[PDB]
Symmetry: D2
């Protein structure tokens, strides 16, 4: 039906929380009121002592990602099952063209894989893995016709996706022109390449070689450069998987001066540290490898959450990019061949809850901002997503702030046989998830429908562009020309 | 009637803006919709090309303040007329007991003056000008019975209102216990007193002696100390009239580490600099005198707005405390006897607009946050105030972002014969103000009703206390006792 | 004789290091040259592969301190033996008047205790434990007649030594007038008192209660306030035992803006952390108690050394204030009655060496600055002390950067039966110490002469006052008076 | 003779100042003593009420620089005359190979031009304008045979000298290996190129187009990147002409964490602001053009001096690169063709004095550090240069802190017919300069000898490399390899 009535709980939006019953009809919220009588035949859910949160939005997923002939184990079906079991009802995945491949053809491939499989709504960012006139031209079609308002370039990955300062400059101008946000994987690629060469030459072949090849100052430098270029163009920039203190500090520094930069920590960075790469077990060590690496500095995750609470970091993704032991073992004598990526789609919200709320770092409202509402505004799908209000989509999570769980591979819903949050006790979990007025997770069991989810288009010139027309006006250099 | 229909404009809340018509019935918003047909006999206002903002909330007013036998010239009637002519539909004024005077008796006096005169809704903070057991006891009655959730102590004014560290500690614990926010006038009082003695001893008697007697480092030091004490108690603190870079930086520093501190710049600090105290005309110079002083550092107001945009400063007050030339002239041979205070209730919003929006520093939504919605949440009157939503109070401002005006005493609605924003050109003004569904400002004319406004109670344990129970839990020192 | 020739070593001053032989005659350096032939009968020391450093200067000692009827176990004889065994040839101790006691009478007592006992040269600071006209007057005699140029006030110790803002202001003006540096024990005394009351009321009686009663934000706040007051007066201020990151950051902040503030970390803060106060053994825990406490934040000592290397902290003292197990046990049911103080006079230099040099944090020259030369300039006894140059005092340490040692009570030369640096392995120690051309430590044995050491007077208006006359000129507020 | 006796003045070194007479014999300081009797026939100079400073060292000169077929107007003869008239007795100039030209052949050319012309001692840095195996190989000969210990690469000048991150990495490793300091012209070259294209396309052809083409964030970004790369290699880096607040802040940030970075402000940055590029007169505007540009932010020069005083910036150069009106006019319709460079060799010290000492920002000793002694240590020519001590070179400046002068082209000793410090009143000037015991400036007149000056070689592995062997040890990544 997509029709359900949720009674006796507390609604929590990012502006306030309050006691109210919520009615969803034909997948849309119809009524919010202190007491809604159940009519004949309507399904009723009890949220006594529980919270109604807008469904989580995961801004950073890589389901079913092709890599070196193999593929990520978590795909669009299993992946979205895991999402809703953890309170996340919307994922944004990355289209990743091969070099010289058309973005439209790559986009077509991605949307076909998803449309068939998704158990919840989704949308897509497009990575700019190579640059040319035709690429520039296909960006316009994506934005105008294919519901895209976000593009991603890489400062890392020399000899493949890496772009230069001159290219990045022009990519950002094109983003500006089309009203798209510009995303950046920000590490100094030339130095990551020299550091990989150095570590392997020293015989440091294990996963720990990964962190040592790329310390956090290379992430902070590249973050700095990408913001300086973006501020010159005068267009919104978005730093994906901000993993380090240094890079977080850079973002805070520039934001303070009024620069239009957004930042995205991820569940791994908020939940674990990089000392697992020094584990004597190779399998365990290699399982935590991703890029940028999870940082071994112990104060890292707390500081990332501090910035998150302040709004100097905006929203939490996962970078969900999962590979099995056998796939990971491709790099057993060479850390550079370990497929990069960890899990998080299922556990993001409970990890954010445990490390943010239960530490006193985040209030309930700041948790909703950090996990749905701000993402929605940034990618221009608010208030359809990320808000419990009349007219908005009936995607809702019944959250129990008092139920405990220890996270383990033995009980997760990922297709991969390892979890980086193994043994971590959390208090506060999703006990029922509702997508389009339908229960898809409840009583510790999934009731998904494969291919239920829909693609959601994202118009250009959203909130991230508010103020920029005026900024362009006041920064006009003709205002500063001397008439001689 | 308190019933009105506003058509063809854009609603602007602090989360998003959108095209919609707004219907107000019996003083409450009834319907928000893209097209509302006017019924028979209903008054219709056109907001074509205009914005519908929640009425401004001024957190810091001193209408009709007794001082040295005389009184502030702007009172509760004329004062609230000026407010609505500038888009402000809610003021919070300070009850100021004399030393040894009952707070309840002082509160009774204040509410009587206001109830008779106000043209818009209001509420009241209570200053703690002296400390004792009975004071502590009357705070409970105020909070429980008299609708107060905010108390103010002074670190300045030696030999009168000043409190010591030990007193401030206990006042904040009492605030914590009652669920009230703790406000602070933060200057080092002992040093302000020695600096006044020094300046006058040097023969520096003019208004410029005022700034020199109290440079900004005394404000920053006292701000620092008040937050450290408040963080130890673990209770929300609120820094009133943050006038300086140094004090703003201190607040940012502590907030970053997760300290629960709020800050309030004022219209004067956002709109002018303290170089007017060096004006060769004594009258002009003395007219800008207030405490803390307006700062002569030119980069001050821009930096205050930067912090405001970031949310490191929360909301804008006025410290509206107006005196005429004759009153100001009491201190003609002694700056210490110049009655302290300037205007701003009328011009706050246009000044914030001109310096925030038209500089590119603030978006439209961040302007609403800075002028209504955040104040409302902080003082626990959201979403009744500071939001255009169904069920909320029909206090609305029709804002024209494109109409210009030069501010002058020759056209203002203050009772005082001087304006600190004289000659300042602003673009973006309130063209119609609506309080409780009734037009009170339109077509450049007032149509107020004296004593129309109501007192609005403010429950304790509002948003400013979210997270604190958990913080108390995790900071519990018994968790850190060694069992020997 | 006080005559000795040191051959084959490297001289290390704070400006450069170089190979040279050093000749000392009648206690003064006579010649520095690449090759000095030994004459008939002259004693020769070999420093092949070793360094010649200026004798260490310990700016902060409390030998033989009266406390609650008992006395510190390390006195002026045993204490100075321990100093030279560790490479320190000059101590500055604090005269501490009782409240209402004459400073001159207290000074007389101190100098009598020392003159009889010291094995190396010394001098004395005077604490201002109470304030009055007569105190102000005795400060002038001390500075003019008794060789003192440094005075100390307390912001902590409510109901005893604590001074208010108004008193501190006037004490600093008096210091300014007399050309003395103003030292400050910087903790918020009112809050330390409320925190002690709170901890004991919770039943947290052990040493860990000490840290919890006084977290580092109370040190940082008081440091901040003391510098703001000192900058207003325009006179040099010196922060003793800077134990925390927060307080170090405050000093860096102000110094950057050009404020005349100096800071003194101590060997304990550079060498250990406060987690020893949570030791399950009461004796061990209580042994690390001092004020301000050693901080449990693990990154503390590294950050203190970073600032030291930068010159944002100037020189290292010890706060050597030692008590035996039996004395410590006075506070067995009450941490507030544990006599405050730890050891360090012997181990300061090796601890600074191990944590500064061997970490790569300090060069050899920066080590000499941090342990002698900067102290000497600050307290105006340079280049007589803290430099190997012709004409300078023949106090020299033969340092072996390659000899290792584990520090222990079983081998130290302190009179106390406990060492806070127990079990710490250091590489780089003093192997021979020379005071006034005489060997007092060599071949792991003492050869001191009791009462050999002399009192060294310290003229007012030293280096710490360079620039201040010009600062007073440019800050003259009459330059900013408006002529009306 | 090179023999002179200076009586009645105060010696000022960077560690202390003191009254003493100084005797120079055969060009070397022979005796320093409170009273030196003049023998028969010895020349005596009176420095009653005056200061004896070590001769100024200018680390950054471009005398006689070939540019676009023309040459800088100040050459090695006239240039060194101007230097000594301003108290500077040592210049370090840059050898600048054309692309594909041998460094040795370029070095040979430079040394030939200088040896014939210099009136005071000099030495040479070598710019790395292109990178190859042979270049790498010629660096070794320069360091081992030709007395060079400093090399310079460019991050600006796309399509000519610019180097990439990968090249810069390898250049710094080569510097490390040879014990040379690595200098960096730090602006983002790709962005400077796009900004030049943009400004000219907008029709902004005047000198103001220069600043607008290259705001300070491009200097701060490139400064940041060069330090991150240098810190990874673990070798000393030196930022030349630090012109901006942003870039100064970056250096402070990294230095704090212990990074081995040095910074060089220049006299123009310390003395004037970039608002002269907006002068309505084209000639005046174009005369202030250099790269990076002088910054129009008014608080710039004060903040640069603050950092200088702190030692976060080390020493002052000039970037003396002078062109006449006719040469400047090459870019009359195109700011990109204006030959870049301003004057400063003559006025550096008085400008530093006026803005540093007379503001209260620098003491006398910190002025000597900033103008000679620190440069000498950094480029490894201390204490031969930058110190008044026995054995050191008899290059001395008699400084009058009380003599005033207004700077003008009508009285300077530059060959160019314009001065950027025109009309600036300074108090404190060089009244007599002495090079190698000979008077070369006195009684407002030059008495130089052309080709008197000598080339001074600079050994590798100087002070800038102290600590680095230990840093390499502790940073060894093999210490962090997991043994599996
Ligand atoms: Zn990435
Ligand atoms: Zn990714
Ligand atoms: Zn106030
Ligand atoms: Zn007020
Ligand atoms: Zn103390
Ligand atoms: Zn002490
Ligand atoms: Zn350059
Ligand atoms: Zn240059």
């Amino acid at each position: 039906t997509g029709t359900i009535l949720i009674k006796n709980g507390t609604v929590v939006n990012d502006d306030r929380y309050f006691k109210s019953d919520v009615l969803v009809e034909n997948g849309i919220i119809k009524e919010i009121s202190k007491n809604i009588e159940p009519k004949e035949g309507i399904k009723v859910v009890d949220a006594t002592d529980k919270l109604l949160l807008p469904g989580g939005i995961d801004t950073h997923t890589h389901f079913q990602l092709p890599f070196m002939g193999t593929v990520s184990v978590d795909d669009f079906d299993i992946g979205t099952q895991a999402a809703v079991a953890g309170g996340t009802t919307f994922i944004i995945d990355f289209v990743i063209p091969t070099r010289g491949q058309s973005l439209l053809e790559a986009y077509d491939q991605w949307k076909k894989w998803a449309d068939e499989k998704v158990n919840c709504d989704y949308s897509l960012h497009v990575a700019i893995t190579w640059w040319s006139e035709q690429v520039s031209r296909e960006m316009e079609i994506l934005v105008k016709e294919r519901g895209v308002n976000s593009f991603k370039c890489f400062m890392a990955y020399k000899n493949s996706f890496m772009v230069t300062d001159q290219e990045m400059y022009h990519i950002f101008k094109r983003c500006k022109e089309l009203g798209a946000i510009a995303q950046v994987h920000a590490e100094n690629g030339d130095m990551v390449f020299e550091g990989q060469k150095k570590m392997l030459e020293m015989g440091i072949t294990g996963p720990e070689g990964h962190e040592l090849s790329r310390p956090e100052a290379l992430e902070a430098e590249a973050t700095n450069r990408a913001i300086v270029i973006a501020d010159s163009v005068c267009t919104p920039v978005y730093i994906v998987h901000v993993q380090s203190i240094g890079a977080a500090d850079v973002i805070c520094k520039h934001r303070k001066e009024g620069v239009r930069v957004y930042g995205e920590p991820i569940a791994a960075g908020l939940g674990v540290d990089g000392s697992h790469m020094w584990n004597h077990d190779w399998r365990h060590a290699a399982a935590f490898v991703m890029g940028p690496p999870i940082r071994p500095d112990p104060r890292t995750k707390g500081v990332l959450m501090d910035y998150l609470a302040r709004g100097d970091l905006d929203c939490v993704g996962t970078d969900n990019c999962t590979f099995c032991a056998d796939q990971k073992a491709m790099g057993k004598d060479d850390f550079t061949k370990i497929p990069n990526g960890v899990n998080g789609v299922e556990d993001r919200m409970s990890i954010v809850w445990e490390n943010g709320v239960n530490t006193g770092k985040l209030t309930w409202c700041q948790f909703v901002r950090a996990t749905s509402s701000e993402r929605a505004r940034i990618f221009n799908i608010y208030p359809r997503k990320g808000r419990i209000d009349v007219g908005c989509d009936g995607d809702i999570v019944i959250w129990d702030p008092n139920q405990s769980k220890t996270i383990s591979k033995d009980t997760h819903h990922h297709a991969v046989d390892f979890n980086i949050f193994e043994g971590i006790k959390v208090t506060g979990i999703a006990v029922t998830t509702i997508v389009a007025g339908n229960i898809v997770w409840s009583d510790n069991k999934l009731s998904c429908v494969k291919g239920s989810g829909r693609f959601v288009p994202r118009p250009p010139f959203g909130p991230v562009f508010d103020g920029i027309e005026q900024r362009d006006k006041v920064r006009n250099e003709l205002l500063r020309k001397v008439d001689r």
